[PDB]
Design a protein around this ligand. Sequence first.
Ligand code: HEM
Ligand SMILES: *[C@@H]1O[C@H](CO)[C@@H](O[C@@H]2O[C@H](CO)[C@@H](O[C@H]3O[C@H](CO)[C@@H](O)[C@H](O)[C@@H]3O)[C@H](O)[C@H]2NC(C)=O)[C@H](O)[C@H]1NC(C)=O
Ligand SMILES: *[C@@H]1O[C@H](CO)[C@@H](O[C@@H]2O[C@H](CO)[C@@H](O[C@H]3O[C@H](CO)[C@@H](O)[C@H](O)[C@@H]3O)[C@H](O)[C@H]2NC(C)=O)[C@H](O)[C@H]1NC(C)=O
Ligand SMILES: *[C@@H]1O[C@H](CO)[C@@H](O[C@@H]2O[C@H](CO)[C@@H](O)[C@H](O)[C@H]2NC(C)=O)[C@H](O)[C@H]1NC(C)=O
Ligand SMILES: *[C@@H]1O[C@H](CO)[C@@H](O[C@@H]2O[C@H](CO)[C@@H](O)[C@H](O)[C@H]2NC(C)=O)[C@H](O)[C@H]1NC(C)=O
Ligand SMILES: [Ca+2]
Length: 595
Amino acid sequence: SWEVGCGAPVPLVKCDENSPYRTITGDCNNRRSPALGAANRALARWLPAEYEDGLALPFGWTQRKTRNGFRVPLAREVSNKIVGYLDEEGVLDQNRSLLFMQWGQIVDHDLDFAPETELGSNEHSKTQCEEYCIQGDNCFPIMFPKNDPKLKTQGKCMPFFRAGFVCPTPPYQSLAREQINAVTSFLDASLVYGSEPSLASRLRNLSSPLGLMAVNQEAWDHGLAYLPFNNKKPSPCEFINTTARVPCFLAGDFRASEQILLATAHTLLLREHNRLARELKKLNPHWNGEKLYQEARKILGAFIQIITFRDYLPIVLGSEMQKWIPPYQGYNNSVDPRISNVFTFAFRFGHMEVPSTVSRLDENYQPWGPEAELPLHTLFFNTWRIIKDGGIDPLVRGLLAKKSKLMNQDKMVTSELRNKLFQPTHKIHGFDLAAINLQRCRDHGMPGYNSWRGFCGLSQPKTLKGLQTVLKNKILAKKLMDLYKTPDNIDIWIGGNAEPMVERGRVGPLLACLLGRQFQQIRDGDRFWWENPGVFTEKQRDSLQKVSFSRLICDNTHITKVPLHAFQANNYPHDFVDCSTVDKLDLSPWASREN
Ligand code: HEM
Ligand SMILES: *[C@@H]1O[C@H](CO)[C@@H](O[C@@H]2O[C@H](CO)[C@@H](O[C@H]3O[C@H](CO)[C@@H](O)[C@H](O)[C@@H]3O)[C@H](O)[C@H]2NC(C)=O)[C@H](O)[C@H]1NC(C)=O
Ligand SMILES: *[C@@H]1O[C@H](CO)[C@@H](O[C@@H]2O[C@H](CO)[C@@H](O[C@H]3O[C@H](CO)[C@@H](O)[C@H](O)[C@@H]3O)[C@H](O)[C@H]2NC(C)=O)[C@H](O)[C@H]1NC(C)=O
Ligand SMILES: *[C@@H]1O[C@H](CO)[C@@H](O[C@@H]2O[C@H](CO)[C@@H](O)[C@H](O)[C@H]2NC(C)=O)[C@H](O)[C@H]1NC(C)=O
Ligand SMILES: *[C@@H]1O[C@H](CO)[C@@H](O[C@@H]2O[C@H](CO)[C@@H](O)[C@H](O)[C@H]2NC(C)=O)[C@H](O)[C@H]1NC(C)=O
Ligand SMILES: [Ca+2]
């Protein structure tokens, strides 16, 4: 047997089934199988899980059981010998703006979220894990190798908690452990509106019947809206500066404040929903609040889908784009729209695209003040630099005029993320995102590198010289061999990111395959995909193809000069045009005449 039975904690509701609007949870998209792609369900498995005991224990848990005959190397040791570098000179992508990196984190947050297990509010396990590095239950510490400088200064390990799973979150036992995806699988702007009934309602402004989203009432950006502050204390955003005491923002996704440019992107989208809702009220005075909200919501989701598939994916996938993603042929109800477990690691290629600094530029795109350029690590869960230091326009300009970091085999992840990451639950700027990614691969039961190469129909190197040829790098292959002792054991996150990039793309062959297949499925398996006949009218679709991120900036900021193609590297002032030259979204096709 299969067992489609286990479904426990899910947010089930009844399907209206003629509603022209998506549900908040993702349910009812697929008519024959209503829960397909919904939030709070297990991530799909394209291949069986690989755990140390076949059921739930990650490889590396029992420093006594090997993987294919060899001990798996420490997550942090692989990070130190392969992922790190010191020199930031020459590391920038010459043909990708900072926005290229930032849009990827937005798309990713719309699609997947596998939360850490809790079982702890007034818990000492969150201390037994952090304080003593005792592995057990959901605590699976990242231990430091001999000679790691963090040993001298931080402790014996980095605390790490296992990801939540379906059927309980208590102990449990029976079938293999499947992690949860707490957001909707469809590209539907759930990062703005929420994936839950609760949260979505709370984000809305129901005092007025205008279909607007709630906005901050304590601060304004030159009369432009800020997201509302989050209710919860202790707040990570005020701990980083107890003097400013500025809390984190409240948005449709819980990671909105992880870094300043992510919060900036979230603010733009919140502003766009409100802009849309009042423009729709101008054209249709009779529409009620709910209708304004849903209609504004539907348009914004179409915008994310368009920017993502027309502008972003072609420059990630490059020449592999047509290979995995065919031109759209219509909705396919037999296609599985669920985000796969391996995708959540494949999409983490963006971590190698994050540069070490962030800039605030003034109106002539010149350095904004004395401390214009800031190290990235000072900006994790930092909301005060926005509210107290200039608003979002200076940050938006930097997104347009600065570059992303280029993935480089000798320089993979910046130290701002590799040694100085700040985690919401803890107090130090001392975590390692690369080590966490590797440890999480094991936590999630990921098959190894060659298993995924096979899945994609690519060769599977078994020797040093095999890897060399595939990676087209002798030194990298050798370092990987000395740590893993067999390409079969290489964790998918580093194996996939170590491959040279495809022509015109920014990921290698393995990743192009994993990414490409996933994106083909959420497009083809989405009943509300924007091009699906009947979702929008021919005239509405005609108006929607003229959207651009440039216009979004023009309409929701006080920036007047923007580039036409925001994802490629743009130099000021030559590549910048005046906002009034940029195509506007024409909303007259939405006008609704009575008689
Ligand atoms: C800080 C972090 C970023 C920027 C400075 C950053 C950036 C990205 C980009 C550009 C991505 C894709 C193009 C991307 C993907 C995914 N991330 Fe990552 N990210 C930062 C920090 C984190 C942290 C912390 C996590 C959680 C790690 C854990 O396993 O505990 C993280 C995750 C992910 C993730 C998987 C999300 C999920 O499904 O649970 C991506 C797909 N990022 N980030
Ligand atoms: C830096 O990156 C740029 C963006 O990837 C790249 O320019 C792009 O090259 C494509 C090639 O396909 C050109 O595209 C378009 O071709 C027809 C127009 O005849 C259109 O119908 C299609 O939509 C297709 O996209 C563009 O000229 C260009 N795309 C954009 C958006 O600018 C640069 O060439 C790169 N620069 C270098 C030196 O590598
Ligand atoms: C914690 O947040 C504080 C802001 O809420 C921040 O202090 C602010 O930063 C600088 C001083 O370093 C000041 O900015 C400018 O103010 C006047 C003009 O009004 C100039 O003459 C100064 O020279 C300075 O350039 C702010 O006034 C200051 N605000 C206050 C109330 O002190 C702290 O730097 C943050 N601390 C940390 C550790 O991040
Ligand atoms: C919900 O919407 C109302 C109405 O648009 C907002 O109230 C307006 O707020 C602006 C700015 O504070 C003021 O100039 C007006 O006094 C208000 N206009 C009206 C007609 O009441 C209200 O702030 C919104 N609430 C939230 C939490 O976002
Ligand atoms: C819609 O997608 C489904 C599921 O991916 C496809 O179904 C395939 O049907 C062909 C028969 O033409 C078989 O070769 C396969 O066994 C199915 N493939 C898989 C991987 O399940 C199909 O391509 C699409 N269906 C239509 C009618 O367009
Ligand atoms: Ca979603």
